């Protein structure tokens, strides 16, 4: 749900069990750590503009199912948390459509050449 | 012309009448003369994929009744429909007991209109044993107004009482000997220019399935049209499209097997599975190469035939291709 509603990416459950479930949380954890370090440096003081786009409460930075420790109503609460985060994702995505759409390329300069006028 | 070009070639060239069905005359003759005898029995069509069973039954139904009457005289059910025991006991029985609809004057003038309906149970082998048992006395009792047609690929999946009730029609495999005329006609209709023997190669590759052959011909024609060079289609292009392993790769595999080194065979198989070849095709090609070779003895051929049969049976169970292929090659290298 997070991937679909934040990156327009659809992935299979099989690939999540095999590849994404381990790699994606690691990448997001590293990015979150880098963002925290950069923020701390700025407070104490564009190239990596894709790193500080990770949200603390919406992104997943933990291995799905926990670590594989082999050789080195919890379910209801997890479902409730999933529903809450899905609602937040839907709220975030709802305003995107009305905000703007890619549509096609037009004469935007001409549109700006006739600005709205409001006066009584 | 665009509307006529909206259909894949298999659906476009599906037989319209019984005359268009090819290579199945042994049953088509009986079905055709049923039009005059009006003595249609319960039927059990059985045979391998793409041999013309569904097409034959559809053509028969069209010929018997016509476009209008058919809608009131035909009940078709297949694997896409729910066919539980309750369905057999209620819906099928109710249709079988339904009074025979009155044909119009036009229908009587133009079509024989036999005084019975038809229930078609396509993919009958998917039905359960109990559901099949529920059909026995329904078919026997209402045979005066209803006739059943069961269709399947695996006849053993039909319970013995139903097989006894139905007159059996085996549909033969369509190969280069009996189905070449239809494929040549289709190629001529679509103006496909192919080298001599190309249709033979397609039919041999298809291995009894004319639907696969027609799809292959369409794919080759599309490739040639996109190329737009005006040249004839070649057998090499057909083999590439069909997924046949090139002869040089098979020769390399055979040399590796002859060498006998386990590590080398494992490495080569690991690299070979990269290309995504289907293990079934590779096994078939290996069988053809080894069984027909005159450089091996009788005991070798017996052992390899049993090994190939075991591997093919395991593959049929949806097993894991890399493991089965490596095991087969290791076993052969040990012969």
């Amino acid at each position: 749900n997070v991937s679909l509603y934040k990156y327009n990416a659809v992935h299979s459950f099989r690939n999540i069990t095999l590849e994404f479930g381990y790699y994606a949380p690691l990448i997001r954890k590293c990015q979150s750590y880098k963002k925290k370090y950069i923020l701390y440096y700025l407070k104490n003081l564009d190239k990596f503009s894709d790193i500080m786009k990770v949200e603390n409460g919406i992104d997943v930075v933990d291995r799905i199912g926990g670590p594989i420790e082999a050789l080195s109503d919890h379910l209801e609460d997890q479902k409730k948390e999933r529903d809450r985060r899905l609602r937040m994702l839907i709220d975030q995505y709802e305003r995107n459509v009305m905000m703007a759409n890619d549509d096609l390329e037009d004469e935007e300069t001409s549109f700006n050449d006739d600005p709205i006028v409001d006066s009584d | 012309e665009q509307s006529l070009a909206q259909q894949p070639w298999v659906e476009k060239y599906r037989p319209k009448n019984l005359d268009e069905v090819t290579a199945q005359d042994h049953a088509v003759t009986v079905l055709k003369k049923t039009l005059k005898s009006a003595n249609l029995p319960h039927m059990l069509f059985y045979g391998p994929p793409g041999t013309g069973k569904t097409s034959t039954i559809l053509a028969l139904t069209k010929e018997l009744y016509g476009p209008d009457l058919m809608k009131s005289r035909i009940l078709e059910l297949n694997a896409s429909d729910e066919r539980g025991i309750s369905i057999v006991r209620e819906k099928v029985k109710n249709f079988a007991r339904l009074t025979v609809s009155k044909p119009s004057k036009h229908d009587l003038e133009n079509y024989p209109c036999p005084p019975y309906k038809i229930i078609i149970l396509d993919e009958a082998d998917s039905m359960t044993a109990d559901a099949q048992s529920a059909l026995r006395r329904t078919m026997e009792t209402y045979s005066g107004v209803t006739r059943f047609c069961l269709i399947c690929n695996y006849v053993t999946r039909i319970i013995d009482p139903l097989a006894s009730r139905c007159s059996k029609f085996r549909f033969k495999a369509l190969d280069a000997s009996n189905a070449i005329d239809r494929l040549r006609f289709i190629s001529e209709q679509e103006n496909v220019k192919c080298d001599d023997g190309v249709l033979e190669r397609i039919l041999d590759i298809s291995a009894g399935d004319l639907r696969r052959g027609i799809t292959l011909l369409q794919s080759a024609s599309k490739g040639a049209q996109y190329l737009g060079d005006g040249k004839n289609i070649t057998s090499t292009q057909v083999e590439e499209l069909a997924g046949v392993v090139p002869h040089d790769i098979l020769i390399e595999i055979v040399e590796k097997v002859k060498s006998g080194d386990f590590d080398e065979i494992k490495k080569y198989v690991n690299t070979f599975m990269k290309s995504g070849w289907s293990a079934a095709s590779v096994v078939n090609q290996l069988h053809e190469y080894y069984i027909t070779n005159d450089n091996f003895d009788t005991n070798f051929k017996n052992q390899i035939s049993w090994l190939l049969f075991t591997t093919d049976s395991r593959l049929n169970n949806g097993t894991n291709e890399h493991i089965q292929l490596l095991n087969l090659l290791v076993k052969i290298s040990q012969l």
């Binding site: 095999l18 994404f20 381990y22 | 995504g276 290791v330």
Partner: protein, 354 residues
């Protein structure tokens, strides 16, 4: 931002950079899509089959095929067991994974797909006179994982309503596909990219991301560690770049899936010790792996080939190992609980080694 697996994903046939012959074949298919047959794409996982299907759809329809949204469809079983399925949709096509329904996948074929096949798609013509008709495109992910009943239900739906629907199924292996379904499809083999092409793609990504690379050899190593899985290659490239301050070096470790490392450790343990207690600990490891929803057959493959990679083992040991692997793979295919067969394989290997 988005993961590099999706960020630099090609969005058109002309953007494909490996397996040129496959691209040419797909373009030939897109020349006259009016009579496009049903398609079945098969090849190694993570090679770009879904990407190629989306590129083909874009060629037929346009970029709008990438404007995807998700809907939830509810199904009720004969036992009143309500459940749901995710359906992805673009204004021109649909995407479904019925295998996520387990044994209930057939219901999805019998209710949803059939309905989609039955509803003929027509629209008012903008300039011409009368309605215009267009067939719908449906993608079936993980086709090889469908039960035989669902595959049987697909047959007459594909045949009868060919005017309204065209199926594009994708699988990693055609062994589980019943013969009729293969007969009803145009089969397209999708080879995995070579190490050179994987390295080229990774180098393009590195240049785009402005990551300092000591030598190109690293990329090659990454390719050799992915076993041709481009998605895995990109994931490990991103992980390594992030873990090394966006500076890769020949000494930088290659990051592999954790379960793969666990299976390697299990193989080492099996080789070192062969006893009942060792078997019980192997059971514990196998159950830990299964708890993460790793498929049993995948575990069997990875364990088998990891064992075959051991240098100390002799020819007889490896031959017996592969024999047992084939037997227990068949048993898993025909079985109900995978633990029995995995344990049997490990016990047989322990017996043959000892």
């Amino acid at each position: 931002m988005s993961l590099w697996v999706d960020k630099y994903r090609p969005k058109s046939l002309n953007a494909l950079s490996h397996n040129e012959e496959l691209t040419n074949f797909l373009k030939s298919l897109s020349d006259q899509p009016r009579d496009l047959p049903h398609l079945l794409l098969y090849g190694p996982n993570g090679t770009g089959k879904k990407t190629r299907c989306m590129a083909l759809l874009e060629s037929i329809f346009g970029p709008g095929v990438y404007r995807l949204k998700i809907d939830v469809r509810q199904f009720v079983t004969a036992s009143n067991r309500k459940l749901e399925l995710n359906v992805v949709s673009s204004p021109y096509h649909l995407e479904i994974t019925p295998s996520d329904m387990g044994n209930n996948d057939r219901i999805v074929i019998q209710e949803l797909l059939k309905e989609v096949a039955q509803m003929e798609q027509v629209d008012f013509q903008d300039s011409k006179d009368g309605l215009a008709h267009r067939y719908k495109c449906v993608i079936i992910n993980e086709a090889n994982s469908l039960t035989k009943d669902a595959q049987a239900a697909l047959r007459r739906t594909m045949e009868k309503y060919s005017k309204n629907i065209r199926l594009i199924m994708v699988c990693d292996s055609m062994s589980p596909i019943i013969a009729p379904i293969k007969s009803r499809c145009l089969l397209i083999r999708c080879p995995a990219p070579s190490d050179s092409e994987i390295s080229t793609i990774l180098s393009d990504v590195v240049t785009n991301e402005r990551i300092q690379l000591e030598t190109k050899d690293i990329l090659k190593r990454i390719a050799q560690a992915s076993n041709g899985n481009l998605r895995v290659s990109l994931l490990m490239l991103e992980s390594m770049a992030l873990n090394n301050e966006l500076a890769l070096k020949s000494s930088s470790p290659i990051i592999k899936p954790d379960w793969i490392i666990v299976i390697h450790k299990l193989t080492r343990k099996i080789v070192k010790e062969r006893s009942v207690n060792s078997l019980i600990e192997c059971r514990a490891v196998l159950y830990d792996l299964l708890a993460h929803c790793i498929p049993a057959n995948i575990i069997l493959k990875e364990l088998t080939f990891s064992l075959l990679d051991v240098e100390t083992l002799n020819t007889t040991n490896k031959s017996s190992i592969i024999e047992y692997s084939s037997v227990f793979d068949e048993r898993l295919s025909l079985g109900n609980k995978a633990i029995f067969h995995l344990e049997g394989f490990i016990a047989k290997v322990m017996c043959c080694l000892d």
